Each structure stands twice: as structure tokens, then as C-alpha cells.
Design a protein around this ligand. Structure first.
Ligand SMILES: C=CCCn1ccnc1C(=O)O
Ligand SMILES: [Zn+2]
Ligand SMILES: [Zn+2]
Length: 231
């Protein structure tokens, strides 16, 4: 059963097996007076592991590495952050100190710097225009266009039909847009349509926060975003 926010004290990390060689990682963090859960991805990359997103902060990210070593025991050699916010790059300095090569798009690295957040070392090329896709070991990285943020990426694991939507996709139980200070509300529905067109075969869909689902999370997220733009 997927771990929930109340089951994970801040500072601890759970791993959840989605498919052979594919895990989500789940952590919790305080934000604006409440504690929220947050998802990332782990994908077997031959004899190594590819990490998608930090565990939201230095301490959580150190716990993530310890849990990976305990439960999987292969080295995390590369990490990708899917946009510039702290639940995605917070902990990049810990990853770097542990030996992990960290990556993000040029826009993400730039927006991280402007924001005063941690900055992944390496720039991912080939993702500057809406609809661009690139291979990165066992996954495909896809820029769908502005949505939750202007730089947000999604990730697909072909071997298992796993779509990691990051913060551009809401879980089913989330019905209000909440915080969207960096969102492009006008573009978010269009960006989600590009995701649907490009990954019509996705069997598992992982939002940035909360419970995994299927392709219904896309239509669900457009409803929430549109309802919010109405007023
Ligand atoms: C989990 C929602 C609270 C707001 N929030 C905090 C961190 N990330 C987000 C997001 O909206 O994606
Ligand atoms: Zn964000
Ligand atoms: Zn987020």
C-alpha cells in the first residue's frame, strides 16, 4: 500500500516498488505551516541507479540515499531534477557530496540560481521547446511546456509504462490548485494535452505529491487548473 503523509515523519523516506527496477521514493516536508508528502523516482540503470528528483531537502535526501543503499544496494550515479523548486533540487548539494552527478535543463538551472536554490551541475540538452524529448539511460525526458512551472519536465520509463508527471500532475484527491505562484495557468491545460498525446500507453502515472494513478490524473489535473482559472 502506498505510504501516506501521516505515516512518514519529516526526515524519513520510504521506497515503493512500482515495477521491476522502478521505485518511487516518498518523503515529507513542512511548507506554509503544514506537512506534505512528495514523490520522486528511482530507476535501475544497468548496474547503477538513476534518481529522479531529490527528497525535498538536505536531510531527507541523505535519508533517501541511506534507504536506497539499505534496500536496493546499487549506486546512485546520476540524478535529474524536473524543475527548480526545493522539492526537486533541495538536496542536490548532498547528492553531489555523495558522488552523484546531478542534472537539470538549462532553464531549471537558471531558475534555481535566480531563486537561490541548489543548482544541479550538468545541463540537459535538447529540451528547450515544448514537445522535445531525449533519452537518458533507461528513461525518456519530456518537456511538455509551461504548467506548474515554466521549466517542468516529465519522465517516462518505457520498460514498465511508468509516467512520472512531477508537480504538473495532481493526485486524484487534490481538488484545489493551491499554490501556483510560478505556474502558467493559461498553458497548463495545453501542456497536459501534449503529455497525453505523447504517452498514450502509460499504465502508471505518478504525481509530484500524493497517490499514483493512471491517465485519469491528467484529465483530473486540467479540471482543477481550469476550475481555478475561472475565479
Ligand atoms: C503539495 C502541495 C503544496 C504546495 N507544494 C509544496 C511543494 N510543492 C508543492 C506543489 O504544489 O507542487
Ligand atoms: Zn514545484
Ligand atoms: Zn511540488
Amino acid at each position: 500500500e502506498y505510504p501516506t503523509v501521516s505515516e512518514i515523519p519529516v526526515g524519513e523516506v520510504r521506497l515503493y516498488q512500482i515495477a521491476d527496477g522502478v521505485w518511487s521514493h516518498i518523503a515529507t516536508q513542512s511548507f506554509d505551516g503544514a506537512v506534505y508528502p512528495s514523490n520522486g523516482l528511482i530507476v535501475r540503470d544497468g548496474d547503477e541507479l538513476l534518481l529522479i528528483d531529490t527528497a525535498w531537502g538536505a536531510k531527507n535526501t541523505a535519508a533517501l540515499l541511506a534507504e536506497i543503499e539499505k534496500q536496493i544496494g546499487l549506486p546512485v550515479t546520476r540524478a535529474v531534477s524536473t524543475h527548480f523548486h526545493d522539492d526537486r533540487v533541495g538536496g542536490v548539494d548532498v547528492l553531489r557530496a555523495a558522488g552523484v552527478a546531478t542534472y537539470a535543463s538549462p532553464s531549471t538551472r537558471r531558475l534555481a540560481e535566480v531563486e537561490g536554490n541548489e543548482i544541479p551541475t550538468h545541463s540537459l540538452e535538447g529540451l528547450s521547446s515544448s514537445g522535445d524529448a531525449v533519452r537518458f539511460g533507461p528513461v525518456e525526458l519530456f518537456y511538455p511546456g509551461a504548467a506548474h512551472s515554466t521549466d517542468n519536465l516529465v519522465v517516462y520509463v518505457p520498460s514498465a509504462s511508468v509516467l512520472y508527471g512531477g508537480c504538473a500532475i495532481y493526485e486524484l484527491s487534490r481538488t484545489s490548485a493551491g499554490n501556483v505562484a510560478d505556474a502558467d495557468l493559461a498553458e497548463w491545460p495545453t501542456s497536459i494535452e501534449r503529455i497525453q498525446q505523447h504517452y498514450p500507453e502509460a499504465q502508471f502515472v505518478i504525481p509530484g505529491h500524493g497517490l499514483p494513478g493512471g491517465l485519469d490524473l491528467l484529465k483530473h489535473t486540467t479540471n482543477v487548473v481550469k476550475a481555478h482559472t475561472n475565479r
